Amino acid sequence: LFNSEEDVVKMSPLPTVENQFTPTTAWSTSVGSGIGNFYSNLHPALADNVVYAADRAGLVKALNADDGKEIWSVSLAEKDGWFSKEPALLSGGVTVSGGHVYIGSEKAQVYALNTSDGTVAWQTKVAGEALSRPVVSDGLVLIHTSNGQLQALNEADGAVKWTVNLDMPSLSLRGESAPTTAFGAAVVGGDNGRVSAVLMEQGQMIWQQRISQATGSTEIDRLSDVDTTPVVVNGVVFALAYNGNLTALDLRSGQIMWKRELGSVNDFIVDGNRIYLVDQNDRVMALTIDGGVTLWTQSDLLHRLLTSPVLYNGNLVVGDSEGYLHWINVEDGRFVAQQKVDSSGFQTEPVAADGKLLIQAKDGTVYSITR
Amino acid sequence: ERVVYRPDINQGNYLTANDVSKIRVGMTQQQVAYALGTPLMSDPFGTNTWFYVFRQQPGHEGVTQQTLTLTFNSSGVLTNIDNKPAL
Amino acid sequence: EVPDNPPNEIYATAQQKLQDGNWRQAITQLEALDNRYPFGPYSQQVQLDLIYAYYKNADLPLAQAAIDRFIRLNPTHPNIDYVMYMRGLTNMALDDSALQGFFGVDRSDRDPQHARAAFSDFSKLVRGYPNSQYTTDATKRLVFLKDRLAKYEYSVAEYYTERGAWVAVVNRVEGMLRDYPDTQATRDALPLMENAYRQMQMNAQAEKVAKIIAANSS
Amino acid sequence: FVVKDIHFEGLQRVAVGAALLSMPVRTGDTVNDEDISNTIRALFATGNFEDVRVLRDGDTLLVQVKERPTIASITFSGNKSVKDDMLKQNLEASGVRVGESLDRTTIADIEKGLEDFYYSVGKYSASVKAVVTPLPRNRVDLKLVFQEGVSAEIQQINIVGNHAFTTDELISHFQLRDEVPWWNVVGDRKYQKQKLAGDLETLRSYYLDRGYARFNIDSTQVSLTPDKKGIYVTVNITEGDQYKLSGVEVSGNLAGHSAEIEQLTKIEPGELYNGTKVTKMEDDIKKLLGRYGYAYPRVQSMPEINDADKTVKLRVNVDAGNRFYVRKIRFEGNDTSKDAVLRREMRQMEGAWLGSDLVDQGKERLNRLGFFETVDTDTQRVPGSPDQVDVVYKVKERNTGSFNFGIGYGTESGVSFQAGVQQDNWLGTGYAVGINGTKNDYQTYAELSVTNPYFTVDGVSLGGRLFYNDFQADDADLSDYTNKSYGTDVTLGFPINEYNSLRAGLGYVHNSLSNMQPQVAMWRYLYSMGEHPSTSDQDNSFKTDDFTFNYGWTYNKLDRGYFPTDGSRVNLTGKVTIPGSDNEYYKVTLDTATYVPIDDDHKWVVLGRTRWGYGDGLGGKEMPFYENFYAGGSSTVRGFQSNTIGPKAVYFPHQASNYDPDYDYECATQDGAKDLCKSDDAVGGNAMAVASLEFITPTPFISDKYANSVRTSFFWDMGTVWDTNWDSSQYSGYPDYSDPSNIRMSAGIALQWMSPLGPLVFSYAQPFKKYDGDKAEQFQFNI
Amino acid sequence: CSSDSRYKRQVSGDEAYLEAAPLAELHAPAGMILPVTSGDYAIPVTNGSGAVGKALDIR
């Protein structure tokens, strides 16, 4: 019927579904339509034993953990988005500290909903789309946004501590540069292909170092799950450009002590001296801190829209936005387990929490993966 | 001719009374052409004779014309603001 | 075109089909020559042989290409003037041509778009190449052509006589009078200037034009 | 060392000297192996050398070169949707083309240029590699794979900060269109940043004219999402506020036109600020000055946007040229038609000032030429004075030669045929010729038509028509009504205005009928003729030398006379008789031609065809049964055969047609259908209301090089024809027609095919309402 | 006049530029001198050693 009408495309699926510790979700309590086709984060924060989790529908839940049961469920509104009074469609993921479920919107908003009812204990607008999850630290709800702005908002009552542009991308090379505080600097990357550390006191540029190019005529990866967000394991500062070129900069000057400009790393953690990273090939691999010495790699993972490789249930778990979870041999690259618990899958990082692996997929959003 | 109206004979390019009073006998062609410009008909035969001339007939009700020519000398200095009417 | 052959293979199979009159199979091998050998030693002649092929295949703008592709690319021949001939010779037949001739209506009062170009090239022949055998047509092919410019321009003086825009009669005529020194349509433009002047009551100015008739009686 | 000679190996697109002078050690120069290595690079610095191997025979150079030039072939592959030439332009952007110096350094800018071309396509996942593949003696193949990953589509233009407009109802009237489910299709939603730029300027022209002078679009953040398809556009804008256009300060060079130059800038002071009216009231003055002969009409507004009361005040800077502007005119693109025939279409005269409308009214008269395809103007201001303009009405003529025919049996049953050929004012004569005719064994028809369309400069179309219809309707004889109707019909055209053009003429219709069919409407009008001949036999005659008076008039505002997209032609034509005619009737009729663009792209254009007519006797008569109205079957409504709209002829009881054919041409005859039958051929009505509703429609699979000349026209066609003398008297136990309730219907597609012999319209319909007496010909193919 | 197994036809054409010799020269009396030529109208006549038209050199 509908086959002969349309045209064709291409991608790369998952090989070697492994189950050596046979995985499963422990609860299933999904928020709704989860991350969506905006560059969005809906990262479920689990506090009060409650997965405060949101989707790109404005709907924020309170999925009380060990069953994900609803403590509360609110749907947030926007104020300038297309006209006004529109659902939040959250770009920033759920941050929770105190009675404050901080979620950032795709239109302009960054919230903080009280963690008993989800009533917005404050919301504070950021300039354009909150490119980052609302990173909440030191009285500052630090967001790097669509306009390249490190925006710090007051985490108790809502008040813009500052909003400072660092690396405005071209149109908006959508880079979650999410501002991590290190050495007095909220270290927050560059969406056009840079990395910065910016002083956490009021947003003073400690350094911004250009890492890789911009997307458009200097063609680098837009298709990367951009984690311009600096994972600052000590001041060899591990971070990414817009394509995800891993770079290890100085914390006070940006001196790139080594880089995987060679890489265009999508999702990376620096597990001590083991930079467990989803590469541009979506190869899960381990790198050092003083170099990108490939302590191991993985070709079992190869072009799935992966999450971050996180150690849980004895193995390095990495889901994807194809729903395949993958428990990686942490010592070398091998699928120990695979859980295809979604098929729209997780554009949020696997929250190895509650004794589970809490996730947010796009359709079957909040599960909690076990083995 | 019993016609009261048909598509009318028409023209433009004829000096306003401003354009006549903008200039004087003695005024050079360029000095004449400062706000009069050039006509669309001058004299290739004799002197500078700048014919700014109208033509019109409003439906066989008497044909109209405004032949406002500027006879200069060959130095271009105006010698005649020659403004002939209809017929 | 023939494939990547030696040039004189392609030049011979160009040249025979000129002598065969197989001008397409000349162009098949005049240009497959110039495909890999436009630096052929005869590529100046090939360009002329292209005009020999094109215009005798009646490919007049393609000749006009190879006419200019002679003078631009390989002008090294004394048939630049032939090219200046064939430029207009393209441009003369490029302007006024129709199937209306068997019924008996005009072509020369029409617009002279390419005919003004043939007016140029046959002038550029008799000016820029006045030595040439090609000037012989070219001198003749200015004479009708300025009258073809005249009888085109006279038609507007003819029409604006009908319009009653009597300035606009003289606008063509005195322009034509300034244009054409010998064409009859200009001598026939000539009284319309006086005629229009008399409707505009420039009767004395009209008789300036009437004494031209006393001189263009001669 | 000094080189004695150089060996020039492998050049084939470049010369020895093209090598030799790009050798820094040329022949005779002192040669070094430094100069050899200088020679390797600089011969490669030709860009026409695939490899350079300069060596020496002691000092005698020997340069060994493979070269990448003249490219033998360029291949494109994997380009599933995008055409290979569109990719070739980015190769031709990168200087890589067939028969040319390849540079294999330029393999990448082929591809990087192409993927960035692919970015601007409406994709971003679309990749390309170029392949260099050498071929005889210099040649190469330039193969290209194309990795078309996915296109890009706009998803939601996230116009944040939007404080007077809901972006969602803006997108429905934006250019980036949406809503394609399996129950709605408007067209695809591909990511067009160029439409998006117009969308933000739709958004600007949404705001700015309400009051929003200091509306501003703050920022714009396209969702460069890791899919390379999902495009959201996080636009920051700021409403500003409603301003009020609250003053008009129009000044500058006004040239004595100062009063209406104020009035062409009328606002009310306090009018909620219209930014578009501000620009409008500029050009309001500009055409005005362009009517005086100033196409130096420089008119520049200035809203003094006064936020102290949230208002603006419109300063306007007006320049009003110098007079007497149109020096002369020219024409071009009429190398085949005489220019003064086209100059008398023109209304701007030389020796005038510029009427900019005068230039274009004759150009609109040039637009309504019909023997054209496009018309332009070229209003060259002649320098040296701002009284000096030459207006070159560059035009383009139409095709010449059109043919028609007819069939039904030939060459074996006598010589029976139909003919017809057209000249289309052949190559621009000023003489329109279209000639037709038919000779069959049942009738022989003669007709002539010639027109001098510009016999006089007013617009007098010297056009005459004559006719000799030796029509017998031969069964084997006058056994089915003769009509030897002959004579002439001459008509002249007269423009009194530029759209108002009148028509009038006379008709000599020397009718000579005999053996008229016993259908009552023949006699019913003959009963109004004073004739009461045989109801029961076809033996009866009808002679009338109908001295008739024809008339007409056009309104001509439909733009093209060739292939319009917009406008309206209102074209009247009717007839009446005179005292002295052998019949005293009239017939008035009116048709139209109006093109209404559905979209403003004018490839979606409504076409209105509707026919209305009435005629009866002027006194004591009728308009004839042979003058009654009709439609159906390629006339207005398709899916029928001809004469299916109208009073369907009812017979008297009949015996013998002077040889009624034995059970053929049966007419309630003695040979069948006996005693008051009715055939399903329309004798038609003395009144008419029939129509057709076609559409200019785009064809995205037909190349629009001739789909602007092919009018693929879907229709639903309808209409009624009734007689005000077919009232239910004899046609009472039969189809009665007295009203516009006799409507036929069909829907389908017309396919106008502009051949070199003209437009060819083939149609197919299904009669969805078929009234009484209607034949069905769904397959109707006309030439 | 009557078809006889693949007859042929007749067409028409024009080459009048070839035969045109300079026409009756416009003059002017004194005090009335129009410029006679404002272009390449006044034929800069050369008729060097060859024919008129396509009878001349072909390549």
mmCIF file with all atom_site columns, C-alpha atoms in Angstrom, chain C residues 3-6 35-37 39 94-101 103 105-107 109-114 116 148 151-153 155-156 158-160 162-163 165 167-172 175, chain D residues 12-14 70 99 135-139 326-340 343-352 365 394 423 426-431 457-458:
data_model
loop_
_atom_site.group_PDB
_atom_site.id
_atom_site.type_symbol
_atom_site.label_atom_id
_atom_site.label_alt_id
_atom_site.label_comp_id
_atom_site.label_asym_id
_atom_site.label_entity_id
_atom_site.label_seq_id
_atom_site.pdbx_PDB_ins_code
_atom_site.Cartn_x
_atom_site.Cartn_y
_atom_site.Cartn_z
_atom_site.occupancy
_atom_site.B_iso_or_equiv
_atom_site.pdbx_formal_charge
_atom_site.auth_seq_id
_atom_site.auth_comp_id
_atom_site.auth_asym_id
_atom_site.auth_atom_id
_atom_site.pdbx_PDB_model_num
ATOM 1  C CA . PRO C 1 3   ? 36.174 8.806  -29.656 1.00 0.00 ? 3   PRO C CA 1
ATOM 2  C CA . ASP C 1 4   ? 39.636 9.742  -28.396 1.00 0.00 ? 4   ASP C CA 1
ATOM 3  C CA . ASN C 1 5   ? 41.324 9.340  -31.774 1.00 0.00 ? 5   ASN C CA 1
ATOM 4  C CA . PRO C 1 6   ? 44.474 10.841 -33.252 1.00 0.00 ? 6   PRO C CA 1
ATOM 5  C CA . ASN C 1 35  ? 37.584 17.622 -28.157 1.00 0.00 ? 35  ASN C CA 1
ATOM 6  C CA . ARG C 1 36  ? 41.077 16.332 -27.356 1.00 0.00 ? 36  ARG C CA 1
ATOM 7  C CA . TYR C 1 37  ? 42.976 18.444 -29.895 1.00 0.00 ? 37  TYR C CA 1
ATOM 8  C CA . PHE C 1 39  ? 45.322 22.800 -30.190 1.00 0.00 ? 39  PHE C CA 1
ATOM 9  C CA . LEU C 1 94  ? 19.173 35.606 -38.741 1.00 0.00 ? 94  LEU C CA 1
ATOM 10 C CA . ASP C 1 95  ? 16.903 38.649 -38.581 1.00 0.00 ? 95  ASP C CA 1
ATOM 11 C CA . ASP C 1 96  ? 14.545 38.806 -41.570 1.00 0.00 ? 96  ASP C CA 1
ATOM 12 C CA . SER C 1 97  ? 13.351 35.336 -42.574 1.00 0.00 ? 97  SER C CA 1
ATOM 13 C CA . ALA C 1 98  ? 9.792  33.949 -42.804 1.00 0.00 ? 98  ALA C CA 1
ATOM 14 C CA . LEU C 1 99  ? 7.423  31.712 -44.799 1.00 0.00 ? 99  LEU C CA 1
ATOM 15 C CA . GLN C 1 100 ? 5.273  34.765 -45.579 1.00 0.00 ? 100 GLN C CA 1
ATOM 16 C CA . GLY C 1 101 ? 7.122  35.416 -48.843 1.00 0.00 ? 101 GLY C CA 1
ATOM 17 C CA . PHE C 1 103 ? 1.955  35.478 -50.198 1.00 0.00 ? 103 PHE C CA 1
ATOM 18 C CA . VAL C 1 105 ? 4.243  40.803 -47.260 1.00 0.00 ? 105 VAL C CA 1
ATOM 19 C CA . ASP C 1 106 ? 7.269  42.621 -45.822 1.00 0.00 ? 106 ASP C CA 1
ATOM 20 C CA . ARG C 1 107 ? 10.333 41.685 -43.753 1.00 0.00 ? 107 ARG C CA 1
ATOM 21 C CA . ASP C 1 109 ? 10.216 47.211 -41.836 1.00 0.00 ? 109 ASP C CA 1
ATOM 22 C CA . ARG C 1 110 ? 10.431 44.658 -39.008 1.00 0.00 ? 110 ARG C CA 1
ATOM 23 C CA . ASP C 1 111 ? 12.755 44.917 -36.124 1.00 0.00 ? 111 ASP C CA 1
ATOM 24 C CA . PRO C 1 112 ? 16.385 44.669 -37.221 1.00 0.00 ? 112 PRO C CA 1
ATOM 25 C CA . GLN C 1 113 ? 17.828 42.793 -34.227 1.00 0.00 ? 113 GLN C CA 1
ATOM 26 C CA . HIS C 1 114 ? 20.396 40.591 -35.941 1.00 0.00 ? 114 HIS C CA 1
ATOM 27 C CA . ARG C 1 116 ? 21.819 45.646 -36.946 1.00 0.00 ? 116 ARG C CA 1
ATOM 28 C CA . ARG C 1 148 ? 16.150 48.024 -43.517 1.00 0.00 ? 148 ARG C CA 1
ATOM 29 C CA . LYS C 1 151 ? 12.095 51.229 -43.291 1.00 0.00 ? 151 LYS C CA 1
ATOM 30 C CA . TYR C 1 152 ? 11.927 49.864 -39.774 1.00 0.00 ? 152 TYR C CA 1
ATOM 31 C CA . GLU C 1 153 ? 12.359 53.370 -38.370 1.00 0.00 ? 153 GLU C CA 1
ATOM 32 C CA . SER C 1 155 ? 7.300  52.612 -39.908 1.00 0.00 ? 155 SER C CA 1
ATOM 33 C CA . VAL C 1 156 ? 7.268  54.423 -36.570 1.00 0.00 ? 156 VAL C CA 1
ATOM 34 C CA . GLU C 1 158 ? 4.484  56.256 -40.510 1.00 0.00 ? 158 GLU C CA 1
ATOM 35 C CA . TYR C 1 159 ? 2.529  55.134 -37.452 1.00 0.00 ? 159 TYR C CA 1
ATOM 36 C CA . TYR C 1 160 ? 2.996  58.309 -35.447 1.00 0.00 ? 160 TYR C CA 1
ATOM 37 C CA . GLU C 1 162 ? -1.465 58.210 -37.884 1.00 0.00 ? 162 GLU C CA 1
ATOM 38 C CA . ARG C 1 163 ? -1.422 58.712 -34.107 1.00 0.00 ? 163 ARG C CA 1
ATOM 39 C CA . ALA C 1 165 ? 1.550  62.599 -31.993 1.00 0.00 ? 165 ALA C CA 1
ATOM 40 C CA . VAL C 1 167 ? 6.300  65.420 -32.419 1.00 0.00 ? 167 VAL C CA 1
ATOM 41 C CA . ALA C 1 168 ? 6.691  61.651 -32.609 1.00 0.00 ? 168 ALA C CA 1
ATOM 42 C CA . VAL C 1 169 ? 6.668  61.729 -36.408 1.00 0.00 ? 169 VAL C CA 1
ATOM 43 C CA . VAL C 1 170 ? 9.654  64.088 -36.499 1.00 0.00 ? 170 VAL C CA 1
ATOM 44 C CA . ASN C 1 171 ? 11.194 62.110 -33.614 1.00 0.00 ? 171 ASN C CA 1
ATOM 45 C CA . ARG C 1 172 ? 11.636 59.226 -36.005 1.00 0.00 ? 172 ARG C CA 1
ATOM 46 C CA . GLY C 1 175 ? 16.463 60.804 -36.150 1.00 0.00 ? 175 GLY C CA 1
ATOM 47 C CA . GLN D 2 12  ? 47.907 15.862 -24.553 1.00 0.00 ? 12  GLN D CA 1
ATOM 48 C CA . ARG D 2 13  ? 45.975 18.936 -23.354 1.00 0.00 ? 13  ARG D CA 1
ATOM 49 C CA . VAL D 2 14  ? 48.878 21.306 -22.796 1.00 0.00 ? 14  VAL D CA 1
ATOM 50 C CA . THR D 2 70  ? 40.602 16.524 -20.622 1.00 0.00 ? 70  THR D CA 1
ATOM 51 C CA . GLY D 2 99  ? 36.924 17.398 -21.435 1.00 0.00 ? 99  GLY D CA 1
ATOM 52 C CA . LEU D 2 135 ? 41.508 7.286  -19.346 1.00 0.00 ? 135 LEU D CA 1
ATOM 53 C CA . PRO D 2 136 ? 43.243 7.564  -22.819 1.00 0.00 ? 136 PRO D CA 1
ATOM 54 C CA . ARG D 2 137 ? 46.456 9.607  -23.041 1.00 0.00 ? 137 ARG D CA 1
ATOM 55 C CA . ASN D 2 138 ? 45.304 12.333 -20.674 1.00 0.00 ? 138 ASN D CA 1
ATOM 56 C CA . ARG D 2 139 ? 41.718 11.522 -19.985 1.00 0.00 ? 139 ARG D CA 1
ATOM 57 C CA . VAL D 2 326 ? 9.577  59.641 -22.903 1.00 0.00 ? 326 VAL D CA 1
ATOM 58 C CA . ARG D 2 327 ? 11.901 60.872 -25.639 1.00 0.00 ? 327 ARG D CA 1
ATOM 59 C CA . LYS D 2 328 ? 10.958 58.040 -27.938 1.00 0.00 ? 328 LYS D CA 1
ATOM 60 C CA . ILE D 2 329 ? 10.004 54.374 -28.005 1.00 0.00 ? 329 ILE D CA 1
ATOM 61 C CA . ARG D 2 330 ? 11.473 51.256 -29.548 1.00 0.00 ? 330 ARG D CA 1
ATOM 62 C CA . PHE D 2 331 ? 10.339 47.731 -30.175 1.00 0.00 ? 331 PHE D CA 1
ATOM 63 C CA . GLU D 2 332 ? 12.305 44.496 -30.240 1.00 0.00 ? 332 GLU D CA 1
ATOM 64 C CA . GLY D 2 333 ? 11.596 40.818 -30.728 1.00 0.00 ? 333 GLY D CA 1
ATOM 65 C CA . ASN D 2 334 ? 9.426  41.661 -33.725 1.00 0.00 ? 334 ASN D CA 1
ATOM 66 C CA . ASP D 2 335 ? 11.886 40.727 -36.449 1.00 0.00 ? 335 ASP D CA 1
ATOM 67 C CA . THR D 2 336 ? 8.923  38.845 -37.998 1.00 0.00 ? 336 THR D CA 1
ATOM 68 C CA . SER D 2 337 ? 5.979  41.226 -37.422 1.00 0.00 ? 337 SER D CA 1
ATOM 69 C CA . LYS D 2 338 ? 6.045  44.867 -38.505 1.00 0.00 ? 338 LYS D CA 1
ATOM 70 C CA . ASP D 2 339 ? 6.866  47.069 -35.539 1.00 0.00 ? 339 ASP D CA 1
ATOM 71 C CA . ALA D 2 340 ? 4.286  49.766 -36.282 1.00 0.00 ? 340 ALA D CA 1
ATOM 72 C CA . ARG D 2 343 ? 3.371  50.301 -32.067 1.00 0.00 ? 343 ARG D CA 1
ATOM 73 C CA . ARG D 2 344 ? -0.331 50.873 -32.622 1.00 0.00 ? 344 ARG D CA 1
ATOM 74 C CA . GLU D 2 345 ? -0.924 48.546 -29.739 1.00 0.00 ? 345 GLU D CA 1
ATOM 75 C CA . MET D 2 346 ? 1.104  51.067 -27.773 1.00 0.00 ? 346 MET D CA 1
ATOM 76 C CA . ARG D 2 347 ? -0.417 54.062 -26.017 1.00 0.00 ? 347 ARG D CA 1
ATOM 77 C CA . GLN D 2 348 ? 2.695  55.898 -24.816 1.00 0.00 ? 348 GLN D CA 1
ATOM 78 C CA . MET D 2 349 ? 3.712  58.220 -27.618 1.00 0.00 ? 349 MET D CA 1
ATOM 79 C CA . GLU D 2 350 ? 7.050  59.740 -28.393 1.00 0.00 ? 350 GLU D CA 1
ATOM 80 C CA . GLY D 2 351 ? 7.193  63.474 -27.984 1.00 0.00 ? 351 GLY D CA 1
ATOM 81 C CA . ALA D 2 352 ? 5.476  63.138 -24.635 1.00 0.00 ? 352 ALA D CA 1
ATOM 82 C CA . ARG D 2 365 ? -2.524 45.944 -25.200 1.00 0.00 ? 365 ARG D CA 1
ATOM 83 C CA . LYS D 2 394 ? 10.807 43.973 -26.459 1.00 0.00 ? 394 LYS D CA 1
ATOM 84 C CA . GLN D 2 423 ? -2.050 30.531 -40.518 1.00 0.00 ? 423 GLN D CA 1
ATOM 85 C CA . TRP D 2 426 ? 1.394  33.792 -40.525 1.00 0.00 ? 426 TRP D CA 1
ATOM 86 C CA . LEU D 2 427 ? 4.734  34.842 -38.996 1.00 0.00 ? 427 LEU D CA 1
ATOM 87 C CA . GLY D 2 428 ? 3.263  38.259 -38.195 1.00 0.00 ? 428 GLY D CA 1
ATOM 88 C CA . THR D 2 429 ? 1.625  39.624 -41.344 1.00 0.00 ? 429 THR D CA 1
ATOM 89 C CA . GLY D 2 430 ? -1.170 41.802 -40.089 1.00 0.00 ? 430 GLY D CA 1
ATOM 90 C CA . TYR D 2 431 ? -3.450 39.362 -41.889 1.00 0.00 ? 431 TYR D CA 1
ATOM 91 C CA . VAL D 2 457 ? -5.008 52.743 -36.190 1.00 0.00 ? 457 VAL D CA 1
ATOM 92 C CA . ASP D 2 458 ? -8.102 52.975 -33.959 1.00 0.00 ? 458 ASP D CA 1
#
